[PDB]
From Swiss-Prot, chains A, B:
The name this protein goes by in its record: Biotin carboxylase
Residue numbers binding ATP: 116, 159, 186-189, 194, 221, 261, 273
Record text on cofactor binding: Binds 2 magnesium or manganese ions per subunit.
Family annotation (NCBIfam families): accC, PRK08591.1
Binding residue positions for Mg(2+) 2: 273, 275
Organism field: Haemophilus influenzae (strain ATCC 51907 / DSM 11121 / KW20 / Rd)
Gene: accC
């Protein structure tokens, strides 16, 4: 089975993966760039291998070097984390072709869900609800395009199949479509929330859905605060969309952890993308289900069945996560530098996922996320109050962080009420 | 209701209490000695009041000064934590007599359970199983003492009613009893485990039991590692002893949080003491029940009912706690001093309850406990592996800690098996 895993990533998720491996007695191989020599997980790994210079293109996206590290250590598997090469079908294809287990879905399934209409295509077949659209590429004859558009109802939105332009009136169609590797047409939702379903699927033909997460708080389409379950969603609705996603997994032959992302508006779900990998915000789902998602990833890659059945999963309580970034809380300019003093919060229902430590220098070369603060409570309110308190205890001296932003979000009356849409944060910042 | 609470304690439990207050929007008043000026919770409290010089006798056991602090702030209540004045009936009596709410049981009930035979007396009446004994003070006529002793069966053990000498043969009775403010006789158990039941009781006449904890790993009768639930204990046995403890609460008029400690041997429970207060190791119970014990303490003092019914409580998974002390791991000599670098562990199922921070100096004046590392897993094994991993990530530079001892305990084959008795640790250390 899995005796040694190459952790093809960095930062907090690399540490998350290391922890999961250690608990399973799996040997860890930390591949890192020269600038990541002092990462907490690198310092804890059983074996370390420099795979290149600081720039991502030369290190963490270096496919030849990553596979060479798996080779010279005798690894059985490679965990891509999220981002970087985790949804690169060439990488997964190349990884299997060299005899290693890729901890994720097969290359074909990544290609499938990596192209937008090809994706919406499969979901439709599987019974997964999609946004009313052209259902396929757009013709260039507008006389007919206007029909589909009027059929589904303005506003519509033109979308790149491998990626956006909003159309409000019929008079601006012809042209809006011209402006660009193809494009489809779809209904534009003005007040949607981001709601996503977590799933697991094994090589024994099983598939389970693990409730949902709401990730509506975003800046430039980048998630900032997430929670679970999604407010307003009943156990009945959960079962419906959840079971549809589970079925779709089997229909498309999915394997490992994945997430179906939907736009949620007026009680309707509309599929927009499947992330064929673990997600950053997976911890909130772990808190409310008791499931260890990364451990399940490893078990599944090992050829084992999911370690529980659907009936075993019950939602309990509520969880929140704040992505703590090294950046100016207003300008969002990255703030690299030495952390002179770190104090991380603790206590009942507080979870801290971070690779940062006092004396650690946050490099400029990669993303700005340095920690994920996660809280759990018996209700949504407790989780929020818990988050607020944990944040105020948190010290990170030496650099700027977005903690002040989180504190603003958490004391927001509308966020406290629940159900704010995907536009709300940028709107509050503007105001 | 409760608007402002005076935290009559220090260290980690003071911080625990502060956190619980903050979540409930209760104002906090931190009373501290001069040496505790830099405690994390003092620095977070809404109001601070120096109540005396470093020595405990002059500060944290200073009843006049503590009540004066409650007065000059207008506090409604005083939380005694554990140790210090938490089981001092004079303090609780004096606290109520001055119009403040004492967050704990009434003075009478503390007196009752504070005297050993008077305690065993009540439990017996309530249906709580006690160790076969003289059931009352020992006569001084041995001709009759030998009857009781032979009745219950050697070995027996003589015990101070306000506190021990073991007797193996009849020939050494007369004398063993002479050696001393009274004493009773009791059966001596050679292979017992320490198993204790957590309870809550409110002023609405309700009482609930919250499963049990096993605290068998001890040195000089001081707990080192605790876990929940107690291995080998079935849901059926749990209900039995648990419901007996709940009933006893009502019979004696108990109020707030408390723990019934038993010796557990060959499937039999034998009451030996009730701690009429929160306990250090309460967190492991919180992890397996989802109950916030300190929040319930506060609600109950506020006159509210326990926020859940017995049926709502289900044991799930398993939890472990390691008491991390500033001491030499072999000699157990305290190791006060500056913590130059702190790194606390995190991740799924890891909880860290500590007032320590990088740059903090551990004073000489008080106990050596600086942190409580708590882990949770879906099974006992996962909890243990989780603890082992968390411990290895933990850095505390500047002073000695007992972390090496914990790591020894956790990799012990017998502890891994489960059910080691109260003598096992001192025995392993000896070997
Ligand atoms: N039909 C629709 N109605 C309303 N908003 C839509 C929409 N279609 C797309 N969007 C918006 O565009 C966003 C996604 O854009 P995009 O196609 O570039 O994916 P993305 O890369 O931004 C998210 P990821 O981080 O998973 O890659 C959605 O989050 C949503 O806010
Ligand atoms: N009948 C018995 N059989 C076996 N061991 C016994 C016993 N009675 C007492 N003991 C031992 O003596 C210990 C308790 O001693 P003691 O009466 O001084 O309370 P204590 O102060 O040590 C515990 P606490 O910290 O709650 O005050 C028990 O933990 C147990 O190990």
């Amino acid at each position: 089975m899995l005796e040694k895993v190459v952790i093809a990533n960095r930062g907090e998720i690399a540490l998350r993966i290391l922890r999961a491996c250690k608990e399973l007695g799996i040997k860890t191989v930390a591949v890192h760039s020269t600038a990541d020599r002092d990462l907490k997980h690198v310092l804890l790994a059983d074996e370390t291998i420099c795979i290149g210079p600081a720039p991502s293109a030369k290190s963490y996206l270096n496919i030849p070097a990553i596979i060479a590290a798996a080779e010279v250590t005798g690894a059985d598997a490679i965990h891509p984390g999220y981002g970087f090469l985790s949804e690169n079908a060439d990488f997964a294809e190349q990884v299997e072709r060299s005899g290693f287990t890729f901890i994720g879905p097969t290359a074909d399934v990544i290609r499938l869900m990596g192209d937008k209409v090809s994706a919406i295509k499969a979901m439709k077949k599987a019974g997964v609800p999609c946004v009313p659209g052209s259902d396929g590429p757009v013709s260039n004859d507008i006389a007919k395009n206007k029909e589909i558009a009027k059929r589904i109802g303005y506003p519509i939105i033109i979308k790149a199949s491998g990626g956006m332009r909003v159309v409000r009136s019929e008079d601006a169609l012809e042209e809006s479509i011209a402006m660009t590797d193809m494009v489809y047409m779809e209904k534009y939702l003005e007040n949607p929330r981001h709601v996503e379903i977590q799933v697991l699927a094994d090589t024994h033909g099983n598939a389970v859905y693990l409730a949902e997460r709401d990730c509506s708080m975003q800046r430039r389409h980048q998630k900032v605060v997430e929670e679970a379950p999604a407010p307003g969603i009943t156990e009945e609705v959960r079962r419906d969309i959840g079971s549809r996603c589970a079925n779709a997994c089997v229909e498309i032959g999915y394997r490992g952890a994945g997430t179906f992302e939907f736009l949620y508006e007026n009680g309707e779900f509309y599929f927009i993308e499947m992330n064929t990998r673990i997600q950053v915000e997976h911890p909130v789902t772990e808190m409310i289900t008791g499931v260890d998602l990364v451990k399940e990833q490893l078990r599944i890659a090992a050829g084992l069945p999911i370690s529980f059945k659907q009936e075993d999963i019950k939602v309990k309580g509520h969880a929140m996560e704040c992505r703590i970034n090294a950046e100016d809380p207003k300008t969002f300019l990255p703030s690299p530098g030495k952390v002179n003093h770190l104090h991380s919060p603790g206590g009942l229902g507080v979870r801290w996922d971070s690779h940062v430590y006092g004396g650690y220098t946050v490099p400029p070369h990669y993303d700005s996320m340095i920690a994920k603060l996660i809280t759990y409570g018996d209700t949504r309110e407790v989780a929020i109050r818990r988050m607020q308190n944990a944040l105020s205890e948190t010290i990170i001296d030496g650099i700027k962080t977005n903690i002040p932003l989180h504190e603003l979000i958490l004391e927001d009356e509308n966020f406290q009420k629940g159900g704010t849409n995907i536009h709300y944060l940028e709107k509050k910042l503007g105001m």
